[PDB]
Design a protein around this ligand. Structure first.
Ligand SMILES: [Ca+2]
Lengths: 504, 168, 176
């Protein structure tokens, strides 16, 4: 008669929410009178009640006709959960929310993976969306709708916990783990009562879990997208692109300050999405016409500012950190030699493909080193002169990394460098200087034309694609057509790219 | 070095239409974000919003003895409905089908010399600046009218051949 | 590792949960036929805006049922667009059309859909775009042109002047 107790309780709840408004004090009296009886006080009773209500609600969805309200029980359940969080005294609230999410994802998993499955993603999606809405509705204006000032303060403190918990479970519900939920999952990632809030929690405490989720997405895309592997996945890409566009519009600093991890996990053939992420521009900045031939970054204050980096790439340099910093601080040729050897030893990896192993360049590490050199360069410039110089440790380190590297090594270095050409800031400026000097350098050991072709390639990848183009790339390319191109031998060797060039 | 490279064969997509699909001056689009896909973005969604307590339980609206107000009486609610402007009646008529207030706004609009077109589901009224000319069979008249367009919230003048079996 | 997963009441479920971790144990995989099916049906059941929309199981009725003409609309209308800074509501069909609404219709909506989003947007139009102020104490909307006026929602449904002895006390007005 305990099963019947929980079933009847939930049924009565559903009937009530179809008769009175959600905020009706009759509801509050219901929950408090529910909690006086103690029928869900003890842990097993609570887990059993949430489980049974969940199963009944999902079944209710399944056995309803589309013309009905198929989410009634689900909707009521969302309300009941958040009201159970609000209207109780908590000695432990994190333990509660964690328990409830646990029950949900457990029932979810069994519904999804079992043999004769009749799984639908929608009722669970609806459950999560509703939870999001309910919390969104009670949280407005620092939980002002909560009467007790103590309880109010408690919820205020709990807010961030709520969102990072939700995100944690959402993370565990990612496409790799539960493909049958994928689209719903993606929708939840960009839910209007999840993404804009976690983009905006104070001191960026929402950014990490967001990046976790976005990385999950990118990885899922990369696994099932190649140049040859041409479908559902493409649909998922399209949605992703929409989401990233929204983010670029609303919170560009999120795309700007996470470009390292975002590039580390982004599929290499997603040219457009790469440009979209790197074209992000801080909210109230207006950029100069990038095609202005008479442009000069010396005459732009913005080009002297240091961009923010949410995750310091130096971590990913591991032991290399200490030597690389040494050489940058006070350069010498023997130290240069040593760290070149160290870097090479770490960047030339053996990757395990299917049926055979092969040599592989550690492109993530390369990006980390290039970004690190850029950051330290910008910092040295702010400290103050000798940073925009060929003799400088930063330029020399990148130069010699390219010079003594394999063709793949060269291409990767130059790629990460071009990635750093974004909005007007000190990185875009300095790396443009670096690139141009490399293009014009007379210090290449019989690899001048190779470097030039690699550079030119890395730019055509960024401009012969549809808009957006990043500011620095449009600028650099403009300076490239109007300096000291078609006379280059390797450009003549190919008529197809020669033509696209000729349009320019 | 063939691969590293200068031999590409021929991503890319015009993002203009996709950007117009979202809400793009500076404007947040994410707080009204319907879905990651267009084909499945088939309705606007309710954003977060703040309702002060003073917005609720407002007593005595138009002398109502109950809170919130309601319109449940054909006989007694005409006096309240009469106080509303044409547009407000249109709003009610298009928002509450099969209710007392739809019937009361129909009757009130009818009284203000609006006529309801059955197949267009749109209200029209005579443009005073011209006199109708009834057709020879008497089943229609040709005249100048003002139609109300509830999607543009506009009165719209039109020369029109109007059939009497089509209005009520 | 977590407390609810280790309860016998969920033992069976736990198995499937643990299965979800399999993709971590094997390094990389071409898409299983099964996974293709799952992904295909996830595409099929993809949640739409209506699924993502806010829940509402009950609203106090505005008006009793009545036998109306079959020629009237039989479903509620859905509006779609065919400091006055920008906010998240600025480009919604509702907000954009409320810009075209008469004070009469805005005041109606404000007092007859209390607690609703329509009310919220009406109040927003009134406050943000027409410089009316709302009073916590008498629930009236005021407007200033030393001469004040208020909309008499209680009786006359018109704008009435306040007396000469009216003073604006900010503590009595709602901060919007
Ligand atoms: Ca390595």
């Amino acid at each position: 008669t305990r099963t019947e107790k929980f079933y009847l309780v939930f049924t009565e709840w559903v009937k009530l929410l179809q008769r009175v408004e959600n905020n009706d004090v009759i509801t509050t009296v219901f929950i408090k009178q529910l909690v006086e009886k103690g029928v869900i006080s003890d842990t097993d009773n609570l887990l059993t009640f949430v489980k049974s209500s969940l199963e009944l609600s999902v079944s209710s969805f399944k056995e309803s006709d589309p013309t009905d309200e198929v989410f009634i029980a689900i909707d009521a359940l969302g309300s009941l959960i958040i009201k159970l969080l609000i209207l109780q005294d908590f000695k432990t609230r994190r333990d509660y929310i964690n328990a409830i999410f646990s029950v949900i994802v457990l029932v979810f998993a069994k519904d999804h993976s079992q043999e004769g499955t009749t799984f639908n993603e929608r009722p669970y999606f609806r459950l999560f969306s509703n939870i999001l809405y309910e919390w969104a509705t009670i949280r407005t204006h620092n939980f002002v709708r909560i009467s007790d000032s103590s309880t109010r303060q408690e919820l205020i403190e709990f807010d961030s916990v709520f969102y990072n918990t939700f995100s944690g479970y959402l993370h565990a519900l990612q496409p790799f783990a539960f493909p049958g939920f994928s689209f719903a999952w993606v929708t939840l990632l960009s839910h209007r009562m999840l993404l804009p809030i976690m983009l905006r929690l104070p001191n960026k405490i929402g950014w990490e879990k967001l990046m976790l989720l976005i990385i999950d997405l990118f990885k899922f895309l990369d696994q099932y997208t190649s140049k040859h592997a041409v479908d559902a996945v493409s649909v998922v890409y399209k949605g992703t692109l929409r989401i990233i566009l929204g983010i670029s519009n609303d919170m560009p600093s999120f795309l700007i300050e996470n470009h390292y991890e975002l590039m580390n996990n982004l599929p290499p053939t997603y040219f457009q999405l790469k440009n979209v992420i790197l074209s992000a521009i801080p909210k109230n900045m207006t950029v100069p016409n990038p095609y202005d031939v008479d442009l000069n970054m010396e005459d732009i204050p913005a080009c002297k500012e240091l961009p923010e980096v949410f995750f310091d790439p130096v971590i990913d340099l591991h032991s290399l950190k200490k030597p690389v910093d040494n050489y940058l601080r006070i350069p010498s040729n023997s130290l240069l030699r040593t760290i070149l050897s160290a870097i090479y030893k770490d960047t030339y990896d053996i990757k395990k493909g299917v049926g055979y192993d092969f040599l592989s360049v550690d492109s993530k590490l390369i990006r980390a080193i290039v970004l690190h050199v850029g950051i330290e360069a910008g910092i040295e410039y702010k400290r103050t002169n000798a940073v925009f110089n060929t003799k400088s440790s930063y330029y020399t380190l990148l130069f010699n990394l390219i010079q003594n590297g394999s063709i793949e090594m060269k291409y990767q270095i130059i790629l990460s460098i071009v990635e750093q050409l974004r909005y007007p800031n000190i990185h875009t400026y300095w790396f443009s200087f670096v690139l141009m000097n490399m293009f014009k350098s007379d210090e290449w050991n019989d690899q001048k034309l190779e470097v030039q072709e690699i550079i030119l390639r890395n730019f055509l990848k960024r401009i012969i694609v549809n808009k957006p183009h990043t500011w620095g790339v449009s600028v650099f390319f403009t300076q490239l057509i109007n300096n000291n191109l078609l006379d280059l031998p390797f450009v003549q060797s190919v008529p197809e790219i020669k033509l696209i060039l000729q349009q320019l | 070095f063939g691969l590293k490279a200068l031999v590409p064969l021929l991503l890319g997509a015009d993002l203009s239409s996709m950007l117009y699909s979202l809400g793009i001056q500076d404007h947040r689009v994410l707080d009204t974000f319907q879905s990651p896909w267009a084909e499945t973005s088939r309705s606007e969604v309710e954003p977060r919003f703040f309702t002060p307590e003073s917005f609720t339980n407002i007593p005595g609206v138009l002398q109502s003895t109950v809170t919130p107000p309601c319109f449940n009486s054909i006989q007694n609610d005409q006096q309240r409905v009469a106080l509303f402007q044409d547009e407000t009646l249109f709003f009610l008529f298009y928002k509450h089908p099969g209710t007392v207030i739809q019937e009361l706004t129909y009757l009130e609009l009818r009284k203000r010399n609006w006529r309801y077109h059955k197949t267009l589901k749109a209200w029209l009224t005579k443009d005073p600046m011209m006199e109708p000319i009834v057709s020879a069979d008497g089943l229609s008249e040709r005249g100048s009218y003002v139609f109300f367009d509830p999607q543009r919230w506009e009165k719209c003048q039109r020369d029109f051949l109007l059939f009497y079996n089509a209005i009520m | 590792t977590n407390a609810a997963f280790q309860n016998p009441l969920f033992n069976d479920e736990l198995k499937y949960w643990l299965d979800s971790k399999r993709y971590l144990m094997q390094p990389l995989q071409e898409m299983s036929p099964k996974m293709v099916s799952q992904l295909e049906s996830s595409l099929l059941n993809c949640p739409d805006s209506l699924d993502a929309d806010s829940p509402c199981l009950y609203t106090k009725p505005l008006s009793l049922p009545h036998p109306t003409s079959i020629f009237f609309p039989n479903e509620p209308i859905r509006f779609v667009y065919p400091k006055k800074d920008d906010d998240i509501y600025s480009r919604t069909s509702l907000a954009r059309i409320f810009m075209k609404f008469d004070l009469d219709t805005l005041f109606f909506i404000f007092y007859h859909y209390q607690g609703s989003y329509e009310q919220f947007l009406a109040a927003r139009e009134l406050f943000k775009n027409r410089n009316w102020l709302f009073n916590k104490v008498d629930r009236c909307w005021y407007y200033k042109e030393e001469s004040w006026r208020y909309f008499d929602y209680k009786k006359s449904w018109l704008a009435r002047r306040c007396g000469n002895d009216f003073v604006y006390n900010e503590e009595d007005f709602e901060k919007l």
